[PDB]
Design a protein around this ligand. Structure first.
Ligand SMILES: CCCCCCCCCCCCCCCCCC(=O)OC[C@H](CO[C@@H]1O[C@H](CO[C@H]2O[C@H](CO)[C@H](O)[C@H](O)[C@H]2O)[C@H](O)[C@H](O)[C@H]1O)OC(=O)CCCCCCCCCCCCCCCCC
Ligand code: CLA
Ligand code: CLA
Ligand code: CLA
Ligand SMILES: CC(C)=CCC/C(C)=C/CC/C(C)=C\CC/C(C)=C/CC/C(C)=C/CC/C(C)=C/CC/C(C)=C/CC/C(C)=C\CC/C(C)=C/CC1=CC(=O)C(C)=C(C)C1=O
Ligand SMILES: CCCCCCCCCCCCCCCCCC(=O)OC[C@H](CO[C@@H]1O[C@H](CO)[C@H](O)[C@H](O)[C@H]1O)OC(=O)CCCCCCCCCCCCCCCCC
Ligand SMILES: CCCCCCCCCCCCCCCCCC(=O)OC[C@H](CO[C@@H]1O[C@H](CO)[C@H](O)[C@H](O)[C@H]1O)OC(=O)CCCCCCCCCCCCCCCCC
Ligand SMILES: CCCCCCCCCCCCCCCC(=O)OC[C@H](CO[C@@H]1O[C@H](CS(=O)(=O)O)[C@@H](O)[C@H](O)[C@H]1O)OC(=O)CCCCCCCCCCCCCCC
Ligand SMILES: CCCCCCCCCCCCCCCC(=O)OC[C@H](CO[C@@H]1O[C@H](CS(=O)(=O)O)[C@@H](O)[C@H](O)[C@H]1O)OC(=O)CCCCCCCCCCCCCCC
Ligand code: HEC
Ligand SMILES: CCCCCCCCCCCCCCCCCC(=O)O
Ligand SMILES: CCCCCCCCCCCCCCCCCC(=O)O
Ligand code: OEY
Ligand SMILES: [Cl-]
Ligand SMILES: [Cl-]
Ligand SMILES: [Fe+2]
Lengths: 36, 33, 57, 56, 334, 97, 137, 30, 244, 32
């Protein structure tokens, strides 16, 4: 059960970091008109 | 469970008859153009 | 009981179910993933991946 | 029969010698499990024919 | 040109057949988890002791349910609001008996739906659109939050959240009426107005536009082929529609500004459904619908019943029978 | 052969008087001076072979014995019915108003 | 039907003397009952011990009989159990226990008569509803 | 048999979803 | 170190009986001129075994193992009662009161749920004659009562019950009732169980004992709807003794 | 007669499925 616990913890952490770093990677600038 | 035994044929024909009808109409539409 | 594929799983070493019975009559057994249910699941998943491969090609 | 003839040799009774035969082994000595006893449109499991074997 | 920047570019790409996006990165897995667990629980889950009284309720097809009666059953009352992931159970056998999958499904679904609403903001930004479609979807989203999360929080148990099934839903409604007199709550009444009116104005708007389609086709073809995707000219005559509708009622009860009209269409059901989601969410804290039981009495003090008291007779019959084995003391305080 | 034993019991004196061996304690409120003090003692000391046995409860004051005599004719005894005395149902049978 | 003196006539004591309240008294009794008593005794039941209600027939079999003004007034002062065997002022509101039940502090002797009067009138108007519980709502 | 029927229909609906999305008639402009 | 509630809560420890130190190998002497009571008896099950139905002739199936699915809710505790001395030096414990039942449901291989009322209600257990000291070889043997798992107010899913509920299958108004009698007439079973307590540790100073127990009883019969199973329960116990 | 209940569905589909196949092919031949 702990293997599972650990696995899920790692998977969630990973997806949350994608999400946070993706929005920190200049998201305002990713639109079709004024970029900055 | 003690279900009505004609429920199966009822359901199968209920699906199959009108579906086949639509498929016939669609395919002969495609071989026109 | 008219079981057709059950014996081919039994033949090569799959002998238990996730519900804790085995075909040799032994109760209370942990087959791990490769139970009758796990082998079936695997073939369904495999079937679905091959489906997508087919659309791509 | 071998097994029966042996038990009687060791001096068990008829009841004792036949009671030592496993059900599994007798069940094989039954033509209902002969695969050449069926029919092409007799469908389903063998239990649907002679029934579910309960006891020797 | 760097690995990360390439990934960021695919994630946020407007060329993907389905937009992914940063909200999508949370949404895709959470919805897949919820969907797979739901499909399997709906077909094969063993019965669940929803009410914690060791009285398992059968919800799945293979245990004698059909489509209408089946449900993924809420988690045990013995768990209350405690978190019950798989790894908190001694076995899957235990997790299944106690309603484990309901919790897995609804948490993943609330996350994924929340991210669904964010994703509507995000693509709107990538395409140069105005942003508030996601504000419209917050009304259904709030409603799901209310029946799966808020109402359990206020009542202290996910066993009183809404079951994931057709008859389960109706069970939730009858129990809710008995305890909250929801029919007599203004926020539910506004919800009916939002939903009846939504259906009304849907039909109105569809009939008025359909009524003023400009002749572009023959009688032997669908009039739908009079419109080509991306044509610049409108395909109906809005003044003829205004001229019909203003006369059907009177002139100033009709829109001739398409923007005000379509904004009206958005606002009415969205606002009504906000209120009805707020009604569920505030009856979660037991601020119930109006109580007029015995409000009318005569000069002597005899009670003169009204329709409200008849409602109450129904409500009592719902009260006394629900969860018939679960109550040991005379007040069902939650 | 399959009989509902509670229904059957309603066909006995249990169905017309206060059965000292089976009736739930809230029934002693129907007669004066019985509840809660004597009703408590009565239930705790059941079972009784005869209605007269309740007067031989150790500790009864002479006034408590008087109240029992006054009420002996509202009492009965019948065989203990497991279904009515298990689960502590003589103190709380799940019935309120 | 109306609130006639016949219905406002209730026993004063066990000896059989009676007393006719006024409509003023009745309404005042109802209001004071709501202020001090309804939280447990709404509709003449007892929420925290449903086996004991305020029906007149129940009050009559209580020791001290309580189906009269005096017994009811005494009860609000020195409540006892149904057999009268013990005083229960520490778990039941009363003037003897107004220190721990502060709502009883400002009740006068006349307020008690009205409360007691309302309790005795109300089954005459409502019948089985009074103390009958939800079955009769 | 009723379980098979219910799941069969549901599965046809999911497959239809796949075709309706990935194998739609593409919208073309003017 | 005496633990507090907030140390225990949520750990599962509240379901465990107190343990005795592995050194506790004393003897607690018994003065027949004194009277004694068990101030606390704690029973903590660790294993649930269920007897199978071999269906065939003289095979008599065995006890197979089961998975518990109702969690850490299984222990009896705070049980007390007279510990008497008989005219032969044997000791008899008479249970008086305590949390002496727990509903448990375990699951067999194949998915069958077996619910059971794990109990020692009305327990009476005796030692051998001439004890005079409780030691790490003393055995108690007794029988107890096993009331129906559900009591008389319990209503089945169609509303039928014993002291409450419908008396027929009201969804089948003109069905023949003879076939439904077993399920329409509820019945309150009352069966006996058997228990052995084997003392393995004794703190002579404090009167605390601890050891091992095996009990055999019947499972739930769902108010006579179906036949019960036989259940074997194994676990550990702890009891504290006091001069009465 | 105590016949097989799946006989009806087997016969029905045995007719229906291949026949619909042929009908589909014939109609789309005709419309080109
Ligand atoms: C749609 C388009 C989009 C494309 C998406 C891409 C494709 C995605 C494909 C995914 C499909 C997944 C399908 C999930 C199947 C669920 C299987 C399950 O839950 O099955 C799990 C099985 C079930 O276990 C058995 O489950 C049983 C459950 O019994 C129940 O079920 C029984 C049979 O059904 C009977 O009913 C029985 O009576 C009833 O109680 C018993 O409890 C057994 O003791 C128990 O072993 O578990 C096991 O033993 C098996 C192994 C798990 C071991 C766990 C140990 C920890 C290892 C960590 C694993 C983490 C997972 C990997 C992470 C990956 C990330 C890198
Ligand atoms: C290698 C193939 C194969 C084999 C050997 C089996 C064997 C078995 N199956 Mg499985 N089965 C298979 C494939 C197979 N199955 C497939 C593909 C499916 C999916 C449809 C199934 C679905 C299935 C189910 C659902 C069940 C079985 C069951 C069984 C058992 C009994 C079968 C029975 O009564 O047959 C009856 C067979 C017939 C009546 C034969 C019909 C042949 C006719 C003559 C048609 C051919 C005529 C043709 C149109 C002529 C046209 C010629 C033209 C050119 C002129 C048996 C162990 C049963 C069982 O016991 O389950 C536990 C059961 O319930 N099977
Ligand atoms: C976007 C990915 C994602 C997210 C957000 C979640 C979110 C969640 N999962 Mg899920 N899950 C996912 C992917 C995801 N899952 C995938 C891919 C799998 C298959 C491997 C699972 C399999 C899975 C199981 C089997 C279970 C969950 C559970 C949960 C819940 C508890 C998670 C937890 O305690 O983490 C804690 C970790 C953190 C707070 C890390 C924070 C990092 C920051 C810096 C939560 C709702 C559990 C649940 O539903 O309980 C009811 C549960 O039992 N998940
Ligand atoms: C004619 C009578 C009538 C009418 C018109 C209504 C109308 C309504 N009632 Mg009332 N009700 C009635 C009688 C009536 N009721 C009676 C008689 C009772 C008592 C028995 C009740 C008890 C009652 C309760 C207890 C509740 C309602 C609620 C509602 C609302 C339901 C719709 C809704 O919640 O949308 C809101 C939108 C949603 C719920 C949608 C969520 C969508 C999510 C985000 C996406 C789902 C994705 C999905 C899983 C997969 C789809 C994708 C796939 C197909 C590809 C609506 C205002 C509900 C309410 O207010 O909820 C807030 C509610 O809980 N009613
Ligand atoms: C014995 C004796 C003497 C007795 C005396 C008896 C006596 C005197 C009898 C005499 C009676 C007498 C002769 C009759 C006169 C009585 C009279 C005044 C009748 C009263 C009539 C009456 C009851 C009216 C019914 C009330 C009625 C329904 C009015 C309310 C108006 C109403 C709800 C309008 C909604 C308007 C609105 C904002 C929404 C419409 C939906 C909408 C948004 C559609 C979308 C849409 C709109 C567009 O606009 C266009 C453009 C397009 C594209 C489009 O999508
Ligand atoms: C091409 C047509 C075929 C394709 C259509 C697909 C089949 C359609 C299935 C729909 C019918 C489903 C019936 C299921 C019942 C069945 O299985 O039992 C099968 C039942 C037969 O009833 C059988 O009777 C037997 C002894 O005679 C036994 O008692 C059986 O137990 C009992 O089931 O079917 C019928 O009785 C059919 C009657 C049809 C008449 C109903 C019409 C009256 C109401 C009008 C409705 C109009 C509504 C308009 C809606 C807009
Ligand atoms: C596409 C849609 C399907 C096409 C139309 C259907 C055609 C079906 C034709 C087969 C009829 C099946 C028998 C009748 C129905 C019947 O009762 O089946 C019903 C049986 C099942 O049998 C059922 O079993 C139940 C318990 O499981 C109970 O026992 C029921 O009594 C019993 O009916 O169906 C099957 O067994 C199908 C097995 C299919 C595999 C056959 C193996 C032999 C294959 C070799 C054939 C080579 C021939 C090539 C010729 C050139
Ligand atoms: C031994 C194990 C080996 C594992 C092997 C790993 C193989 C990877 C398999 C994944 C293949 C993915 C194919 C994607 C197809 C595609 O979309 O192409 C389309 C194009 C190309 O791709 C895109 O548009 C990206 C969009 C992807 C969106 C994912 C959608 C899923 C959303 C969740 C749905 C939940 C609700 C629905 C429930 C009905
Ligand atoms: C003592 C009490 C004191 C009072 C207290 C009252 C407090 C509440 C007051 C709230 C004020 C509301 C202002 C609304 C203005 C508006 O939205 O303008 C926006 C547009 C602009 O109109 C358009 O106006 C345009 C000009 S301009 O944009 O406005 O400048 C013009 O171009 C166009 O043709 C015209 O239609 O108005 C219209 O389109 C009509 C839309 C109707 C809006 C109502 C939504 C409510 C939904 C009800 C949900 C319940 C049902 C369930
Ligand atoms: C709960 C906090 C109560 C409040 C407030 C009031 N009453 Fe009460 N009452 C309560 C209980 C639990 C009981 C039973 C006491 C017992 O153990 O016997 C009662 C009982 C009475 C009775 C006697 C009923 C009878 O003999 O049939 C009376 C007359 C009564 N209570 C009156 C009364 C009044 C007048 C109150 C307002 C001042 C009042 N009670 C408040 C619980 C509670
Ligand atoms: C899960 C608990 C049991 C341990 C699992 C063992 C590891 C997985 C074994 C899977 C067996 C498949 C091997 C044969 C496949 C041959 C390779 C191929 O053709 O793709
Ligand atoms: C379409 C996906 C296939 C799923 C197959 C699962 C079948 C499980 C139910 C089997 C039916 C049980 C009883 C059979 C006789 C009626
Ligand atoms: O309404 Mn009635 O109240 Ca809310 O709990 Mn008490 O009973 Mn039960 O768990 Mn579902 O339900
Ligand atoms: Cl319910
Ligand atoms: Cl309760
Ligand atoms: Fe429009």
């Amino acid at each position: 059960m702990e293997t599972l616990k650990i696995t899920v913890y790692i998977v969630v952490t990973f997806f949350v970091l994608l999400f946070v770093f993706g929005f920190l990677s200049g998201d305002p600038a990713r639109n079709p008109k004024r970029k900055d | 469970m003690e279900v009505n035994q004609l429920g199966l044929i009822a359901t199968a024909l209920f699906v199959l008859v009108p579906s086949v009808f639509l498929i016939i109409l669609y395919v002969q539409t495609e071989s026109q153009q | 009981q008219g079981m057709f594929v059950l014996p081919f799983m039994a033949r090569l070493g799959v002998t238990g179910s996730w519900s804790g019975w085995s075909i040799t009559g032994e109760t209370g057994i942990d087959p791990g993933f490769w139970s009758f249910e796990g082998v079936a699941l695997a073939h369904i998943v495999l079937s679905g991946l091959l489906f997508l491969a087919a659309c791509w090609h | 029969n071998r097994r029966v003839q042996a038990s009687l040799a060791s001096g068990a009774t008829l009841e004792e010698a036949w009671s030592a035969i496993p059900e599994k082994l007798a069940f094989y000595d039954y033509i209902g499990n002969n695969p050449a006893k069926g029919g092409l449109f007799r469908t389903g499991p063998m239990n649907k024919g002679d029934g579910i074997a309960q006891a020797w | 040109a760097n690995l990360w920047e390439r990934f960021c570019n695919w994630v946020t790409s407007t060329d993907n057949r389905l937009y992914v996006g940063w909200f999508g990165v949370i949404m895709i897995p959470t919805l897949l988890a919820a969907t797979i667990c739901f499909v399997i629980a709906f077909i094969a889950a063993p019965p669940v002791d929803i009410d914690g009284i060791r009285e398992p309720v059968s919800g799945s097809l293979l245990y004698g349910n059909n489509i209408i009666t089946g449900a993924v059953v809420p988690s045990s009352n013995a768990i209350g609001l405690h978190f019950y992931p798989i790894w908190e159970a001694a076995s899957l056998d235990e997790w299944l008996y106690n309603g484990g999958p309901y919790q897995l499904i609804i948490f993943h679904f609330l996350l994924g739906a929340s991210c669904y609403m964010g994703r509507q903001w995000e693509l709107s930004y990538r395409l140069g659109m105005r942003p508030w479609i996601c504000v419209a979807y917050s009304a259904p989203l709030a409603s799901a939050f209310a029946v799966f999360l808020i109402y359990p929080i206020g009542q202290g148990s996910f066993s009183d959240g809404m079951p994931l099934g057709i008859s389960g839903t109706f069970n939730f409604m009858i129990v809710f009426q008995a305890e909250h007199n929801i029919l007599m709550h203004p926020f539910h009444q506004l919800g009916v107005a939002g939903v009846f009116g939504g259906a009304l104005f849907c039909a109105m708007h569809g009939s008025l536009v359909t009524s003023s389609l400009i002749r572009e086709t023959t009688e032997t073809e669908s009039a739908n082929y009079g419109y080509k995707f991306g044509q610049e000219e409108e395909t109906y005559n809005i003044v003829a529609a205004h001229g019909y509708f203003g006369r059907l009622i009177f002139q100033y009860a009709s829109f001739n500004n398409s923007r005000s009209l379509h904004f009206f269409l958005a606002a009415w059901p969205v606002v009504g459904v906000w209120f009805t989601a707020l009604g569920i969410s505030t009856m979660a804290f037991n601020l119930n619908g109006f109580n007029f039981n015995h409000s009318v009495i005569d000069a002597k003090g005899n009670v003169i019943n009204t329709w409200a008291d008849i409602i109450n007779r129904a409500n009592l019959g719902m009260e006394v029978m629900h969860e018939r084995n679960a109550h040991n003391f005379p007040l069902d305080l939650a | 052969e399959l009989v509902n034993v509670v229904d059957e019991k309603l066909g006995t004196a249990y169905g017309e008087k206060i059965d000292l061996n089976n009736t739930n304690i809230a029934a002693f409120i129907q007669y004066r001076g019985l509840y809660p003090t004597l009703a408590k003692l009565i239930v705790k000391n059941a079972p009784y072979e005869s209605v007269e046995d309740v007067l031989n409860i150790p500790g009864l004051t002479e006034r408590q014995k008087q109240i029992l005599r006054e009420n002996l004719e509202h009492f009965t005894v019948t065989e203990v019915e497991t279904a009515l005395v298990e689960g502590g149902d003589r103190y709380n049978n799940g019935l309120y108003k | 039907a109306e609130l006639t003196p016949e219905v406002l006539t209730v026993p004063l004591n066990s000896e059989g003397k009676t007393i006719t309240l006024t409509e003023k008294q009745y309404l005042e009794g109802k209001r004071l009952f709501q202020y001090a008593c309804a939280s447990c005794h709404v509709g003449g039941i007892t929420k925290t011990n449903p086996s004991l209600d305020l029906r007149t027939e129940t009050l009559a079999l209580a020791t001290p009989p309580r189906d009269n003004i005096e017994g009811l007034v005494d009860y609000m002062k020195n409540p006892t159990t149904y057999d009268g065997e013990q005083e229960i002022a520490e778990v039941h509101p009363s003037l003897r226990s107004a220190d721990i039940f502060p709502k009883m502090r400002n009740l006068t002797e006349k307020d008690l008569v009205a409360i007691a009067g309302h309790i005795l009138v109300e089954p005459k108007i409502l019948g089985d509803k009074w103390g009958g519980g939800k079955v009769y709502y | 048999m009723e379980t098979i029927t219910y799941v069969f229909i549901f599965a046809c609906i999911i497959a239809l979803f796949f075709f309706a999305i990935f194998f739609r008639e593409p919208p073309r402009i003017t | 170190q005496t633990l507090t509630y907030d140390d225990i809560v949520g750990t599962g420890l509240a379901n465990k009986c107190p343990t005795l130190d592995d050194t506790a190998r004393g003897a607690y002497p018994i003065d027949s001129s004194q009277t004694y009571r068990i101030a606390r008896l704690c029973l903590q099950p660790t294993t649930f075994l269920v007897k199978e139905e071999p269906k065939n002739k003289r095979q008599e199936a065995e006890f197979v193992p089961t998975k518990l699915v109702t969690r850490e809710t299984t222990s009896l505790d705070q049980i007390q009662g007279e510990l008497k001395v008989n005219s032969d030096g044997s000791l008899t414990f008479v249970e008086e009161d305590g949390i002496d039942f727990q509903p448990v449901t375990v699951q067999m291989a194949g998915g069958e749920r077996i619910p059971l009322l794990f109990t020692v209600k009305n327990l009476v257990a005796s030692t051998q004659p001439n004890v005079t000291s409780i030691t790490t070889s003393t055995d108690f043997k007794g029988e107890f009562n096993v009331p129906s798992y559900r009591t008389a107010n319990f209503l089945d899913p169609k509303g039928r019950g014993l002291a409450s509920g419908y008396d027929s299958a009201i969804a089948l108004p003109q069905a023949k009732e003879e076939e439904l009698a077993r399920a329409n007439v509820k019945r309150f079973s009352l069966t006996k169980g058997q228990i052995s307590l084997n003392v393995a540790k004794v703190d002579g100073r404090t009167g605390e004992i601890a050891g091992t127990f095996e009990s055999e009883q019947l499972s739930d019969d769902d108010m006579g709807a179906h036949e019960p199973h036989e259940v074997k329960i194994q676990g550990v116990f702890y009891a504290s003794i006091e001069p009465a």
